[PDB]
Tab-separated table of C-alpha atoms and ligand atoms in Angstrom:
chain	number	residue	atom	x	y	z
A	164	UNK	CA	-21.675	16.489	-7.400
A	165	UNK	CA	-21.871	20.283	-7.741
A	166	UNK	CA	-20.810	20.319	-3.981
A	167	UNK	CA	-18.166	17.689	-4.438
A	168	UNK	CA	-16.692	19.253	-7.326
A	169	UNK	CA	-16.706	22.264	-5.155
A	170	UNK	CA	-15.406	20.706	-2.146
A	171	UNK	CA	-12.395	19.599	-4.576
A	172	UNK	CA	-12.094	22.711	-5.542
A	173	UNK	CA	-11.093	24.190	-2.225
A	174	UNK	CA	-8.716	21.635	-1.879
A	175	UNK	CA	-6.641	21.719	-4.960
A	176	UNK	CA	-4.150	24.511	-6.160
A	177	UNK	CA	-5.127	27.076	-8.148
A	178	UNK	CA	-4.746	27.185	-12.553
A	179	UNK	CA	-3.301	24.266	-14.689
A	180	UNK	CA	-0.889	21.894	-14.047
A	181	UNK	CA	0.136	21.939	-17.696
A	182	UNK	CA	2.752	24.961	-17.692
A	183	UNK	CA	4.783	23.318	-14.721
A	184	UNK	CA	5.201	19.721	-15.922
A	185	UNK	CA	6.774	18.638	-19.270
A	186	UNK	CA	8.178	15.408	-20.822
A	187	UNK	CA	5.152	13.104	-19.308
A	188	UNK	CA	5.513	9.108	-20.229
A	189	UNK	CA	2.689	7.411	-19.699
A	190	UNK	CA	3.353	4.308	-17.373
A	191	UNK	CA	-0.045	3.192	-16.353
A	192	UNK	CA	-4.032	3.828	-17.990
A	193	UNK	CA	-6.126	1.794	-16.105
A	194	UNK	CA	-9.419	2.641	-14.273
A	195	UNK	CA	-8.211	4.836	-11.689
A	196	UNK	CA	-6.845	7.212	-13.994
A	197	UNK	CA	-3.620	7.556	-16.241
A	198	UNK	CA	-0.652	7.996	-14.642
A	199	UNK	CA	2.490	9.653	-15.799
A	200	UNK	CA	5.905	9.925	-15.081
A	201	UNK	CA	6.865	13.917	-16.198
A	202	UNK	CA	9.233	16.746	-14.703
A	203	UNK	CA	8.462	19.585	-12.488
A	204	UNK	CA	10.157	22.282	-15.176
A	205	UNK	CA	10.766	24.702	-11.877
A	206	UNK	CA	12.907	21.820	-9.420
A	207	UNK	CA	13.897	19.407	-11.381
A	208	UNK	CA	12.266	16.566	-9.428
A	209	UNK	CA	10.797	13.713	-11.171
A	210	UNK	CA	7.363	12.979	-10.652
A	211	UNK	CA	4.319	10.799	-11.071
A	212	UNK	CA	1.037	12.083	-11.718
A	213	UNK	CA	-2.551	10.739	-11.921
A	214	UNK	CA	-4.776	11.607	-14.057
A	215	UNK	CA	-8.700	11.482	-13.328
A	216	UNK	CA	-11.918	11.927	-15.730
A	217	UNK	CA	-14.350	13.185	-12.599
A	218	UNK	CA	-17.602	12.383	-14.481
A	219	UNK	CA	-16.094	8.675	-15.166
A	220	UNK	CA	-15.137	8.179	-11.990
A	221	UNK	CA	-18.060	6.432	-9.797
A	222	UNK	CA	-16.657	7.492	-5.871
A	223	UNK	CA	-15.905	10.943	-6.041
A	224	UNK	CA	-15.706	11.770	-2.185
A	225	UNK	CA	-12.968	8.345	-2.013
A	226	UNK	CA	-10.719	10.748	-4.026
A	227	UNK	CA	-11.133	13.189	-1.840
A	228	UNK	CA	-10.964	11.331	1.309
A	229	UNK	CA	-7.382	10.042	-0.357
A	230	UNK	CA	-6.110	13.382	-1.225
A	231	UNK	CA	-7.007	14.515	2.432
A	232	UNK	CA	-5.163	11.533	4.073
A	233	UNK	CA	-2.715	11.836	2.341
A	234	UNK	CA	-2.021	15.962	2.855
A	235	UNK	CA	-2.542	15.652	6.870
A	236	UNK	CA	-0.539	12.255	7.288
A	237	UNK	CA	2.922	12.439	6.006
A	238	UNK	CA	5.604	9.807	6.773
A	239	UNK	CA	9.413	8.883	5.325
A	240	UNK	CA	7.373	5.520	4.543
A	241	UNK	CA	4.282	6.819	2.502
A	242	UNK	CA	4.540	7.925	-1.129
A	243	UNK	CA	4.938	11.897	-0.783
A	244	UNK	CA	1.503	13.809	-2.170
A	245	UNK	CA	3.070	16.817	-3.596
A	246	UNK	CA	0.171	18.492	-5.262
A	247	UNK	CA	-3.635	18.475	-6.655
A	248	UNK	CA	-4.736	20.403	-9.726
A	249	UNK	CA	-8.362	20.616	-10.945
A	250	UNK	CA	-8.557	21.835	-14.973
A	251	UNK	CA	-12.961	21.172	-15.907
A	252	UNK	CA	-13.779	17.818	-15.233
A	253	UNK	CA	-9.789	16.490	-14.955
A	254	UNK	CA	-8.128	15.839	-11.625
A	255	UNK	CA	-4.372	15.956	-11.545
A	256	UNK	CA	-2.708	14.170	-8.248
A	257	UNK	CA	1.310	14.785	-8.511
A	258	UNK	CA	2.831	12.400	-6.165
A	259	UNK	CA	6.896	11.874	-5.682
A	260	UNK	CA	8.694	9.689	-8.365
A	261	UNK	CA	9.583	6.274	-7.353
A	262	UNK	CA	12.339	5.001	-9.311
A	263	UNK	CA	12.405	1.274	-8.323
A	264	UNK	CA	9.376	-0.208	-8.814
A	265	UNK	CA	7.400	-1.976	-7.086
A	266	UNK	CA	7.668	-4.738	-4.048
A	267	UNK	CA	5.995	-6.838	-6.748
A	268	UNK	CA	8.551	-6.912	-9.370
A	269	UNK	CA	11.081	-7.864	-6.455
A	270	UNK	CA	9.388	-10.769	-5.137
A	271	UNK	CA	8.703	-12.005	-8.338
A	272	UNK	CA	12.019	-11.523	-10.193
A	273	UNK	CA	14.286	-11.785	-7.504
A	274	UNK	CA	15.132	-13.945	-4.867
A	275	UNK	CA	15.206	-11.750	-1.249
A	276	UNK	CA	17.380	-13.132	1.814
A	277	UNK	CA	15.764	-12.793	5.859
A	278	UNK	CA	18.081	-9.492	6.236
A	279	UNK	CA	16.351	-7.785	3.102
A	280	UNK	CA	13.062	-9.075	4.083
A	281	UNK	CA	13.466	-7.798	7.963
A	282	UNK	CA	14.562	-4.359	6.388
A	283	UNK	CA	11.406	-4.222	4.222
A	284	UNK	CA	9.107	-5.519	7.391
A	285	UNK	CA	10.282	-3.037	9.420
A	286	UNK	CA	9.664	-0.329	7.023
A	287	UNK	CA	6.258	-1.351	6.392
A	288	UNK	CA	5.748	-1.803	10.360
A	289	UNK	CA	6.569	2.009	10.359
A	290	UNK	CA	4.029	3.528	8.205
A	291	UNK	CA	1.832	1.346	9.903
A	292	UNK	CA	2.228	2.134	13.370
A	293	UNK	CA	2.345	6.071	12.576
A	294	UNK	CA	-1.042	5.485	10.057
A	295	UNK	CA	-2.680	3.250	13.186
A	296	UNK	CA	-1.764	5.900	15.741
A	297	UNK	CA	-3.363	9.005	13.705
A	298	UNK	CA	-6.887	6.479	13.592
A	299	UNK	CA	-5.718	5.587	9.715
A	300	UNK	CA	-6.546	2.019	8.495
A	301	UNK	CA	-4.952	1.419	4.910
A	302	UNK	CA	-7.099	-1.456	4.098
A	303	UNK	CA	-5.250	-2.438	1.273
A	304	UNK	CA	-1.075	-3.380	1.876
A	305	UNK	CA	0.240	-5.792	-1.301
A	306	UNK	CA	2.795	-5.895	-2.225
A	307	UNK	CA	1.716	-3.840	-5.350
A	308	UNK	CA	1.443	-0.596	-3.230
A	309	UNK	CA	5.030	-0.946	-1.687
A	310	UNK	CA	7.326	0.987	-3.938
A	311	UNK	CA	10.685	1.455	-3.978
A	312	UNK	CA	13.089	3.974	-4.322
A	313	UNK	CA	16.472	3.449	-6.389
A	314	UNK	CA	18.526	3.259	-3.159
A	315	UNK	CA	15.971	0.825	-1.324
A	316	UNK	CA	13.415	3.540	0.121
A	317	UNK	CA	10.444	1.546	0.983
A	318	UNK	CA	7.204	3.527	1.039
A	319	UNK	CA	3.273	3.073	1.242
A	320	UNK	CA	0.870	4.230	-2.099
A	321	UNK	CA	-2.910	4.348	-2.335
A	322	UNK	CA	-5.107	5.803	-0.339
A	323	UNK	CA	-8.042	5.371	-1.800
A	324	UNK	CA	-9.878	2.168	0.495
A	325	UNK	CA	-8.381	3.929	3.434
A	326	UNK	CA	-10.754	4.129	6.348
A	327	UNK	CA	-10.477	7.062	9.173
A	328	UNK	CA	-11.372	5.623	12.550
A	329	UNK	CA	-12.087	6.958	16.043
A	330	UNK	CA	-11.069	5.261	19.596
A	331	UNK	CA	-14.938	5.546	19.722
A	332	UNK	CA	-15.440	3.682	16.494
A	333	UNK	CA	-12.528	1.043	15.978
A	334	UNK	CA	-14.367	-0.943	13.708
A	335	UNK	CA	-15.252	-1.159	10.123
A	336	UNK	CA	-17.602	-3.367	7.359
A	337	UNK	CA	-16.944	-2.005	4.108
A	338	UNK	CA	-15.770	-4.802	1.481
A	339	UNK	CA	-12.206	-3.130	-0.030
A	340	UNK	CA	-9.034	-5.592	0.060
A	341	UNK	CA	-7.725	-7.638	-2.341
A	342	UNK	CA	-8.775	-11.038	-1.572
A	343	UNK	CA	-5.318	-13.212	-1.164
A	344	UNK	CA	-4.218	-10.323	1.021
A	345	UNK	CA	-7.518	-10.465	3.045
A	346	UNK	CA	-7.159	-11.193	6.973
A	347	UNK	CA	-9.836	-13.746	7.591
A	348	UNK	CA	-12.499	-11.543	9.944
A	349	UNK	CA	-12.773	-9.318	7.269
A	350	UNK	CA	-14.976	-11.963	5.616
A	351	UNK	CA	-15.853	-14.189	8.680
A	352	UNK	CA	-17.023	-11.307	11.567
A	353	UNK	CA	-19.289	-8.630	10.221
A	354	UNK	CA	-16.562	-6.005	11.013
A	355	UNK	CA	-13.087	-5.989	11.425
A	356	UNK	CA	-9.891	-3.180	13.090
A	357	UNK	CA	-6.738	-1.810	11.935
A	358	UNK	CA	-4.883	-5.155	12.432
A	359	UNK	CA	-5.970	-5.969	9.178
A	360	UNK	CA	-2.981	-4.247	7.835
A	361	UNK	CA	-0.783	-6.496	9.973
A	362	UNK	CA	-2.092	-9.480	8.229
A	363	UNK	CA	-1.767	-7.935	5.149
A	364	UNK	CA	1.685	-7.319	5.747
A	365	UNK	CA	2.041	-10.891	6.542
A	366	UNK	CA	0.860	-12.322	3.244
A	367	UNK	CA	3.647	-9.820	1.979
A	368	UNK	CA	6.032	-11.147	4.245
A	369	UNK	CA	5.601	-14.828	2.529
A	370	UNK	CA	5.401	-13.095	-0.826
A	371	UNK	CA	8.642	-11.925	-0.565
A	372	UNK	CA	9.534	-15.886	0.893
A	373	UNK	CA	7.675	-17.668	-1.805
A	374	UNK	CA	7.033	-15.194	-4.505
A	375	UNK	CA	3.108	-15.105	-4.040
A	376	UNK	CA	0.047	-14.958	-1.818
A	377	UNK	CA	-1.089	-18.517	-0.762
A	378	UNK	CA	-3.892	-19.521	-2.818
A	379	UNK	CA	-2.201	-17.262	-5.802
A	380	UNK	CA	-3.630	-19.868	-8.715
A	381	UNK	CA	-7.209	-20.534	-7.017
A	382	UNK	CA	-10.383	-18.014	-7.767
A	383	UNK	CA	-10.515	-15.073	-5.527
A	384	UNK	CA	-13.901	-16.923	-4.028
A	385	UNK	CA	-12.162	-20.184	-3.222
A	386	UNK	CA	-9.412	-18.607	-2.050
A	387	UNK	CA	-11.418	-16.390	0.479
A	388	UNK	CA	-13.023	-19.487	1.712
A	389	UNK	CA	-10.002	-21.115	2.026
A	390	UNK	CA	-8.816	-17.997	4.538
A	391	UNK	CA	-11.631	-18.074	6.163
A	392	UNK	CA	-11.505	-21.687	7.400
A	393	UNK	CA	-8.014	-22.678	7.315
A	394	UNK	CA	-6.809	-19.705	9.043
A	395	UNK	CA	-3.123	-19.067	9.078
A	396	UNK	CA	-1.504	-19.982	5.971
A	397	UNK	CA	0.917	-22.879	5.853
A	398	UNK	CA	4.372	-22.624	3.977
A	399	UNK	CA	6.074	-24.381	1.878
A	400	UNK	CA	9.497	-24.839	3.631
A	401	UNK	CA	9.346	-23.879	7.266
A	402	UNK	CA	12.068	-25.113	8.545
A	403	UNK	CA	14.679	-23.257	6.276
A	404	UNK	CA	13.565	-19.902	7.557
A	405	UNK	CA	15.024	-18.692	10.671
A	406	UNK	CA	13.379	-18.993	14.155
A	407	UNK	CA	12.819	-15.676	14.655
A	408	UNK	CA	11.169	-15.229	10.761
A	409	UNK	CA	8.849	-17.909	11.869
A	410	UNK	CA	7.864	-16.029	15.072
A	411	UNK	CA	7.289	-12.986	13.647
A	412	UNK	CA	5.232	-14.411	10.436
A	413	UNK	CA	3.232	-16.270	13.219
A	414	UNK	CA	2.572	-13.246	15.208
A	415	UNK	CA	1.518	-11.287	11.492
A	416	UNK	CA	-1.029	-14.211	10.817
A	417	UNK	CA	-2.341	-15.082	14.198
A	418	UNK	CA	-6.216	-15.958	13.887
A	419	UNK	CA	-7.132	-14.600	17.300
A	420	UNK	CA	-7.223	-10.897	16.312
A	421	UNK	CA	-6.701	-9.871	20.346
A	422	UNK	CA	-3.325	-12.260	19.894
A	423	UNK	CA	-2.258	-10.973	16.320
A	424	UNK	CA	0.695	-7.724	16.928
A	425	UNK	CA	-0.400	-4.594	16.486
A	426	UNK	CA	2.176	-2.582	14.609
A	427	UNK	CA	3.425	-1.102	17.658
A	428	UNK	CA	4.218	-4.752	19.653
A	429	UNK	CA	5.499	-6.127	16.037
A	430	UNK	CA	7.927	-2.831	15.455
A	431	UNK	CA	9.779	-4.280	18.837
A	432	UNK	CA	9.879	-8.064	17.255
A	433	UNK	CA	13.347	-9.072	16.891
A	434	UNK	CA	13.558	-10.242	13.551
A	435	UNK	CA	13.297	-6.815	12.702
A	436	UNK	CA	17.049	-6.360	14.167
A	437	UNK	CA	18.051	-8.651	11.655
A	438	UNK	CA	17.579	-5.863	8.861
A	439	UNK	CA	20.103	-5.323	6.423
A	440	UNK	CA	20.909	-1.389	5.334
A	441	UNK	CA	17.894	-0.723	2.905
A	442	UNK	CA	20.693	-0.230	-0.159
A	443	UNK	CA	21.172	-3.910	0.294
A	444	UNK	CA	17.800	-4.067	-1.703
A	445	UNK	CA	19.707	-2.070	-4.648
A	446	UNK	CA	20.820	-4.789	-6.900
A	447	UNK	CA	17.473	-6.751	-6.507
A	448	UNK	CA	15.348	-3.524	-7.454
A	449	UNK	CA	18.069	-2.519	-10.522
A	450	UNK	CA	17.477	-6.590	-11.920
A	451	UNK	CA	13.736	-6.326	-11.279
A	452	UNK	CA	13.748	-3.142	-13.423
A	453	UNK	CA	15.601	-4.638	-16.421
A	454	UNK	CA	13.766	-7.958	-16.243
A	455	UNK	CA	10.454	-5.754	-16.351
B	73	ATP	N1	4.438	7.645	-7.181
B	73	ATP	C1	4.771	6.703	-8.106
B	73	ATP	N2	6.046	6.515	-8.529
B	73	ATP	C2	6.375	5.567	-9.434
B	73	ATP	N3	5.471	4.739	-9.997
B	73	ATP	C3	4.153	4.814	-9.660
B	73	ATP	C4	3.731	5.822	-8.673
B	73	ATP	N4	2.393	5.681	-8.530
B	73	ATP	C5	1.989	4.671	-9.333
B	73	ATP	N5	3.036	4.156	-10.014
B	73	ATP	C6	2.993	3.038	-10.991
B	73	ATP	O1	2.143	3.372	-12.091
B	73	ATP	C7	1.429	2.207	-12.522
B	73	ATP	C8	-0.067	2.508	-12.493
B	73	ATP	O2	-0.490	2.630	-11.141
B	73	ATP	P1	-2.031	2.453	-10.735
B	73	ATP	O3	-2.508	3.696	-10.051
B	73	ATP	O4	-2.792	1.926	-11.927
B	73	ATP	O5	-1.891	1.315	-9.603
B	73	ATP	P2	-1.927	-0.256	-9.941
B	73	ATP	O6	-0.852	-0.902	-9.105
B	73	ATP	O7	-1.913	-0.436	-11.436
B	73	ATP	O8	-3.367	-0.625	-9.311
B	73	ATP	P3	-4.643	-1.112	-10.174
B	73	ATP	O9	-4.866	-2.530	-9.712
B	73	ATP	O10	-5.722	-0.127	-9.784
B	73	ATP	O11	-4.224	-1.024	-11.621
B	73	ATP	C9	1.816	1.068	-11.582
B	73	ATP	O12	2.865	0.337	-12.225
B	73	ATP	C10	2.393	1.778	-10.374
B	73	ATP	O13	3.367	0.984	-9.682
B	74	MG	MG1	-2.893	-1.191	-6.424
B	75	MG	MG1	-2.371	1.828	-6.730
């Protein structure tokens, strides 16, 4: 830990955080750190920073493998790393503000039409294909790390299950998803690729549908055996969705790995070029916001 510590040292900026930030509001506590909203007192811009114990935190070199993913892979559709600070044992990570939420509060408090959904997809698709193409699996896409910017931004957060691949090595084993979210090989084969995103993205896709994961209510066991043998999930009413939504959902969720998209095929699909203009997703994110 000496040498992780150290290695974290070389990565971060130099001196405390403290002076450059002021006003922070505390908008989350839980187990991977505190996280505040606060001001950089120099620009102006809002931001959100974590906050890490080091000698509570179990996975030190995850935290740095996130911090170092996130530095050398920047994208319009991933949450912008600004900055890392290292005061003792306490780990500051200052991302970008977002000001609209998350996907979550959306889908749950509003009621999305195929043209915002297509427009969401699509940006999704693109931090996919770029994180895909630089040998990035994310591992972990719900609709809780999708958040939004005031003006309908879409962009990917949390880095830490991330895996960093090789064309040599497309494969991996370790256990990280969420389970409702889980593409069925990742429990079924002993390893599994990058198009575990893409089936990820299709549970989000019926999220944003029918306002939750299938298998939402059931145990996160007995939903993971329900994946695993019923394969792609069935919805609730197909046939008022759009033939082209139904394509693409079915191309998100195919069993058959080799005949699920990757992100690059499914960034051609056409019910992408349905998409509204992302500030179509304005008024859902502002009523989200007050109802939460
Ligand atoms: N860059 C950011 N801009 C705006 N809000 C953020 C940002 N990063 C995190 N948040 C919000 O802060 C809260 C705390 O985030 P946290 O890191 O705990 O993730 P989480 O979604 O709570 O995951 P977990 O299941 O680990 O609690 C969440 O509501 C999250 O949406
Ligand atoms: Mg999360
Ligand atoms: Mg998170």
């Amino acid at each position: 830990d000496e040498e992780i510590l150290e290695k974290l040292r070389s990565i971060v900026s130099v001196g405390d955080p403290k002076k450059k930030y002021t006003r922070f509001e505390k908008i989350g506590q839980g187990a991977s750190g505190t996280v505040y909203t606060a001001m950089d007192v120099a620009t102006g811009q809002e931001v959100a920073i974590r906050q890490m114990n080091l000698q509570q935190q179990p996975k030190k070199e995850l935290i740095i493998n996130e911090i170092l993913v996130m530095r050398e892979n920047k994208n319009p559709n991933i949450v912008n790393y600004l900055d890392s600070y290292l005061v003792g044992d306490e780990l500051w990570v200052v991302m970008e503000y977002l000001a609209g939420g998350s996907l979550t509060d959306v889908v749950t408090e509003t009621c999305m039409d195929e043209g915002q959904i297509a427009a969401v997809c699509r940006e999704c698709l693109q931090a996919l294909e770029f994180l895909h193409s630089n040998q990035v699996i994310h591992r972990d896409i719900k609709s809780d790390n999708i958040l939004l910017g005031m003006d309908g931004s879409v962009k990917l957060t949390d880095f830490g299950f991330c895996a960093q691949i090789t064309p040599e090595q497309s494969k991996r084993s370790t256990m990280v998803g969420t389970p409702y979210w889980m593409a069925p090989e990742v429990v079924t084969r002993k390893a599994y690729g990058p198009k575990v995103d893409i089936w990820s993205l299709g549970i989000m896709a019926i999220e944003m549908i029918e306002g939750e994961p299938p298998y939402l209510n059931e145990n996160p066991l007995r939903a993971l055996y329900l994946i695993a043998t019923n394969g792609t999930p069935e919805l609730q009413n197909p046939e008022k969705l759009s033939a082209i939504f139904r394509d693409f959902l079915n191309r998100c969720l195919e069993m058959d790995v080799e005949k699920r998209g990757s992100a690059k095929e499914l960034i051609q699909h056409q019910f992408l070029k349905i998409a509204k203009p992302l500030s179509s997703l304005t008024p859902l994110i502002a009523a989200a916001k007050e109802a939460t």
